[PDB]
């Protein structure tokens, strides 16, 4: 029903959604927090080393790890 934080006060209601099959050339799934030793070939753009979780929950500070985070997305 809602996207993002502050859902309790009604922020980010979903009007609709769509899932579409697209060619890989359009964009990749790598625009996320990658492992430290992730292969360079699969990375899209510049990745800056930072501390982040690789699995949900990403807010758990005990699960944080040195990870590659895309600079063009943070």
Question: Are 53 and 64 within 8 A, CB to CB?
Answer: yes
Residue from 49, 58, 71, 73 touching RNA (CB under 7 A): that is 58
Task: Rule CB under 7 A: say whether 64 interacts with RNA.
Answer: yes
Beta carbons within 10 angstroms of residue 68's beta carbon:
22
Question: Are 30 and 46 within 8 A, CB to CB?
Answer: no
Task: Rule CB under 7 A: say whether 60 interacts with RNA.
Answer: yes
Q: How many residues bind RNA (CB under 7 A)?
A: 19
- Binding part of the chain for RNA, among 23-31, 38-46, 50-58 by CB under 7 A, reads 50-58
Tokens of 50: 């930072």
Please report, as ranges, the residues that interact with RNA according to CB under 7 A: 1-9, 33, 51-53, 56-60, 64
């Amino acid at each position: 029903r809602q996207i993002g934080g502050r859902r309790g006060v009604g922020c980010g209601r979903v009007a609709g959604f769509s899932v579409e099959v697209v060619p890989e050339v359009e964009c990749t799934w790598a625009l996320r927090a990658m492992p430290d030793d992730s292969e360079q070939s699969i990375l899209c753009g510049e990745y800056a080393l930072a501390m982040s979780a690789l699995q949900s929950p990403y807010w758990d500070r005990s699960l944080h790890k040195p990870a590659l985070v895309p600079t063009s997305l943070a």
